[PDB]
């Protein structure tokens with residue numbers, strides 16, 4: 001979806017970089033770990049910067065792992081993380097980039113929104129919508145749907161995959177539901193409101209079939225039961241809103257199907273987490289089904305339903321708005337490069353000063 | 366008398382190891398049976 | 400002994416003979432033996448009724464206030480004694496236990512009436 | 526006297542022993558490791574209490590949540606399942622600093638710092654968080670922070686003054702009459718100066734002890 005300018009690497013490749021032989025730098029880091037001594041962030045930064053071959057990536061991946069499991073793991077620099085993804089794309093090691101991104105806890109690769117778009121867009125152009133979906137799930141787990149550009153790309157991948165996937169497992173429903181909800185909340189357009197109702201519907205299904213703990217456990221989601229109540233509120237909000245907002249017809253069918261399925265179904269971690277006084281969600285389904293029909297009637301009466309499919313609405317939204325986002329993101333990208341360049345120079349200078357002082361200390365000693 | 370919401374909060378915390386709920390005690394000491 | 404750590408406490412030290420208990424209220428370091436070294440004697444408690452049917456407690460309320468003002472803890476039996484006297488509020492478990500005893504005698508009275516009613520059925524059978 | 530003589534072996538032993546402790550200090554990944562099959566700590570063999578078994582299998586530790594977040598979740602809000610069940614009002618920590626245990630192969634053990642907000646009332650300074658190794662922590666989602674942290678304080682209804690105990694009240698009134706003070710005012714205790722925190726209020730982690738490094 002993104003333009004060639006967005007994915008161009010002329011600016012990154014033109015960065016000022018110090019020339020250090022990887023073998024020499026490798027020895028320094030190995031000695032530090034043998035002596036249980038901290039390694040500098042500038043050291044790991046120089047290694048990633050001076051990667052010159054596909055084989056070098058494999059060695060750098062090992063050292064990124066070692067840095068994560070070292071005293072100065074927190075100090076991994078943003079430009080070092082961005083350069084890693086840039087180097088992986090350059091030498092054809094996209095699987096490695098996704099591997100470290102998925103295994104973030106082990107390698108410590110937490111990219112920014114611009115870096116996420118670069119990796120996600122590579123897969124989209126190649127047609128690998130299974131790997132692109134993995135990037136979206138990684139963005140969702142980190143709750144990083146801040147930049148508008150990322151939201152448009154994420155919703156395009158989600159809706160395109162959902163159309164192909166007729167059958168969804170409970171884990172898939174949970175991951176898709178969360179991804180749609182978080183990305184949708186940011187967007188106030190028809191596509192944004194449709195994804196919120198779609199996301200709550202899927203999560204509500206998992207809540208009433210496997211319990212509320214399946215939805216929130218290890219997920220960026222709330223633990224209070226009543227996701228189908230949140231879904232119905234989206235319908236009631238759009239219907240009663242003074243402004244004219246529309247919900248795609250495809251989402252409404254999904255919610256009706258979910259309500260029907262749940263309504264007429266056919267070691268010591270077993271706790272009742274809800275108070276006895278509070279009504280269980282299962283008992284509330286009869287009332288939920290009445291609200292749905294009433295809201296659907298009011299929405300259709302007010303002509304607030306969009307017949308067009310969600311995949312077609314999202315495609316139009318991406319085409320209209322993504323071009324503008326590319327210009328804004330690229331402007332911020334240039335500023336970040338200059339900020340990173342200045343911060344890197346400061347670290348190099350501070351390193352030189354302490355080494356000079358180290359000589360004076362030995363002279364005194 | 367505890368509030369009903371607080372009695373439910375304790376039934377959840379100690380679920381599986383509970384005793385029968387006790388009501389208000391007798392107003393006076395019951396005369397010893399003889 | 401040379402104690403290290405601990406606090407001053409007001410507790411009952413057991414005296415007397417076998418089947419004849421008698422208590423001395425004392426202020427003592429908590430690590431000391433029950434009947435051993437103390438700091439001050441703050442009263443006495445005789446738990447056996449006397450000729451008049453009276454259990455006799457003596458409290459040096461001036462020195463007790465002094466040692467509570469200096470951090471002296473109180474043992475649970477001594478907290479119960481101060482509650483009966485009126486110097487402290489009644490202890491939470493003194494009230495709870497009194498409620499349990501009331502609920503336990505209510506059951507006994509009800510059972511006796513049920514037994515009498517069952518005995519009444521026997522009387523009806525003759 | 527003068528027949529009391531030095532004890533060099535005792536002096537040597539004390540210093541040598543203290544030195545070894547510093548050299549072979551254990552790490553959080555070792556002291557707080559657990560075998561989930563037996564729910565017993567291998568370092569010491571301590572079996573966890575029974576009331577903690579359900580949560581050890583059903584809940585996560587703090588740095589397990591934070592290891593998955595950028596910057597180890599600095600600025601994020603974290604609450605405890607025990608608080609969620611006990612208190613209706615919001616209870617959470619606002620994370621400010623986080624020192625993971627790098628030795629841990631998953632960065633799942635460490636120390637944390639933050640600003641406490643207990644039962645809707647917020648402290649003014651950051652302090653170290655206690656019970657970081659418990660299976661009780663729940664990360665708050667960013668989109669749910671505003672609804673979670675919303676609290677409106679109710680007017681305090683707990684009495685501010687109470688009567689004196691029956692005997693101590695009579696001794697106060699008796700002293701008044703003896704000293705010539707004539708009044709029918711009722712002696713009243715003031716409870717404002719001495720109000721107790723809840724029993725589950727977070728305690729000071731800085732002043733807490735750490736287990737020794739001798740395995741059982």
Ligand SMILES: [Mg+2]
Nearest residue numbers: 724725726728
């Ligand atoms: Mg405790």
